Amino acid sequence: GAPLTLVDFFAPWCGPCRLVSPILEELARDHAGRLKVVKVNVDEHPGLAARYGVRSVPTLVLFRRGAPVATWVGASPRRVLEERLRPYLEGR
Amino acid sequence: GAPLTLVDFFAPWCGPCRLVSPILEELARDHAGRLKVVKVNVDEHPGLAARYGVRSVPTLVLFRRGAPVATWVGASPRRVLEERLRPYLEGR
Numbered sequence: 074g075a076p077l078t079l080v081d082f083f084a085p086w087c088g089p090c091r092l093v094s095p096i097l098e099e100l101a102r103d104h105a106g107r108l109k110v111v112k113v114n115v116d117e118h119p120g121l122a123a124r125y126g127v128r129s130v131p132t133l134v135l136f137r138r139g140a141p142v143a144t145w146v147g148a149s150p151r152r153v154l155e156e157r158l159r160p161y162l163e164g165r
Numbered sequence: 166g167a168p169l170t171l172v173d174f175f176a177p178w179c180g181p182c183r184l185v186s187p188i189l190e191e192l193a194r195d196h197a198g199r200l201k202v203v204k205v206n207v208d209e210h211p212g213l214a215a216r217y218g219v220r221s222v223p224t225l226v227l228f229r230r231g232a233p234v235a236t237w238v239g240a241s242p243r244r245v246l247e248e249r250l251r252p253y254l255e256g257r
């Protein structure tokens with residue numbers, strides 16, 4: 074399968090981001106062979122956030138072959154995130 | 166449930182967009198009470214495409230409460246699109 078990288082755009086002053094980040098790390102750990110998770114502090118790298126259209130946090134962007142294939146805005150429960158990622162994890 | 170609007174950013178010179186557009190219209194028809202689909206020709210409205218970070222077509226952007234909540238890049242089979250939308254259609 075093509076490698077997948079989930080980028081977690083967050084800010085230190087964001088409450089919901091606090092919820093999501095450990096869920097994402099658990100996910101990466103649980104699907105280590107197929108999924109890499111990287112956190113990007115939007116206040117540390119605003120140009121990067123702008124390059125990928127991040128206008129609020131948390132924003133999760135899934136990359137395949139070095140380009141975004143999906144972007145989800147806002148925090149969501151573990152179950153919801155698992156299900157969004159599953160088709161990509163089970164796909165080519 | 167909050168109304169949902171799926172925006173289909175396409176271009177007349179895009180092959181895959183030809184596949185996706187009728188699938189999206191079938192979806193809207195099939196979930197008429199909860200989902201509205203709008204097509205935006207990126208060559209007709211480049212400012213709009215840029216506002217929502219559209220860099221390739223087709224790009225599908227789901228709006229809830231007037232703001233994007235999810236964005237999927239590229240064409241996908243009917244089954245895959247149905248499943249991406251289902252949680253939002255079944256959610257608040």
Ligand SMILES: [Mg+2]
Nearest residue numbers: 100103104155
């Ligand atoms: Mg899992």
Ligand SMILES: [Mg+2]
Nearest residue numbers: 192195196247
């Ligand atoms: Mg349907």
